[PDB]
Each structure stands twice: as C-alpha cells, then as structure tokens.
Amino acid sequence: SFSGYLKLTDNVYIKNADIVEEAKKVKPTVVVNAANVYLKHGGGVAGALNKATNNAMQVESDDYIATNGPLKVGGSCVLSGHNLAKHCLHVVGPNVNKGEDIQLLKSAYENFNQHEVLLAPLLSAGIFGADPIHSLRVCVDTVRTNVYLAVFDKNLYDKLVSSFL
Numbered sequence: 001s002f003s004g005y006l007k008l009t010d011n012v013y014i015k016n017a018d019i020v021e022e023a024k025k026v027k028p029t030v031v032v033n034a035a036n037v038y039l040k041h042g043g044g045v046a047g048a049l050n051k052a053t054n055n056a057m058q059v060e061s062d063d064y065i066a067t068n069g070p071l072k073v074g075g076s077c078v079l080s081g082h083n084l085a086k087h088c089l090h091v092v093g094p095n096v097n098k099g100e101d102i103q104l105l106k107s108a109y110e111n112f113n114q115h116e117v118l119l120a121p122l123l124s125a126g127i128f129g130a131d132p133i134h135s136l137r138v139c140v141d142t143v144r145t146n147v148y149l150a151v152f153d154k155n156l157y158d159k160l161v162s163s164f165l
C-alpha cells in the first residue's frame with residue numbers, strides 16, 4: 001500500500017513524490033488528475049499522468065469530451081486509470097492563471113468524497129496558480145475520505161508540512 005506518508009489529519013496524508021511514480025508503484029484504486037474542463041492533459045500533473053499512459057488517457061478523454069462536452073470548473077469525471085490506477089478521477093480545480101474563481105476549490109475537493117481512498121495532487125496548485133498552502137487547507141477541511149497527497153516539489157513539500165496548522 002502507500003508508504004512513507006506523513007499523517008496530517010485522521011484522513012489526509014502527504015509525501016514528497018512524483019505522483020506518476022507513486023501511481024506505478026501502488027496501483028491505487030483511484031489516482032486524481034489535476035484536469036482542465038476540456039481534459040487536455042498538456043502540462044503539470046495532467047501532462048505527466050497522460051505521458052505515463054503513452055497518451056491512452058488523452059485518447060480516452062477526447063472520446064469522453066466528444067460525447068459529453070466539457071466538465072465544469074469544480075467538477076469531475078471517472079475514467080480509466082490505464083497503467084497507473086484502476087480509475088482516474090479527473091478533477092477540475094479553478095485555474096487562477098486563467099482568472100477562475102478560487103472559491104470553486106472546495107467544490108473541486110468535494111469530488112474526492114465519492115471515493116474511499118485516493119492518490120492525489122494538491123488541486124489548483126503548481127501551474128494552476130493557487131497558493132498550495134491554501135489548497136492543502138481546503139483539502140483537509142473538505143475531504144473526509146482517505147487522501148494520499150503526492151507533492152512533486154521538495155521545497156514546497158517542506159513548506160507545506162512546516163506551515164501546517
């Protein structure tokens with residue numbers, strides 16, 4: 001199972017790790033993707049998870065979008081986890097760099113509550129432009145299910161742990 005995670009709360013754990021490498025090792029039931037509404041997995045966690053699936057995630061996502069249209073900011077969809085997980089929960093956190101509403105971050109994390117356990121990144125952090133300390137705070141105050149957070153950046157990981165209230 002998940003190893004080397006620091007316990008933050010009863011249900012939130014954190015580790016300085018590459019979510020692609022964590023997913024290939026654990027093969028969790030659910031890996032969360034930091035998706036956009038179009039499921040265009042270009043960069044950040046999305047680009048990395050998609051590249052690990054040899055673009056199979058993007059092919060499946062384009063078929064999903066062709067059928068269903070775009071997701072909502074704060075929304076999600078469950079697709080295959082390919083070689084990474086049983087399922088991938090594609091969750092759209094607000095992208096502050098695209099001028100999206102930061103209040104939608106709590107709605108985005110609510111999607112995690114539909115799954116007992118998840119391997120996940122911090123939503124809206126990194127290239128999405130939100131403050132990762134705020135994202136972790138919203139995560140621990142919103143998610144009630146077991147969430148194993150993988151934070152790629154070591155310095156950010158240390159900052160998150162040392163400032164956690």
Ligand SMILES: COc1ccc(NC(=O)Nc2cccs2)cn1
Nearest residue numbers: 018019020021044045048126152
């Ligand atoms: C948040 O941005 C990222 C970017 C990259 C990553 N992981 C990777 O790229 N992993 C790779 C495995 C093998 C070859 S490259 C995670 N997070």
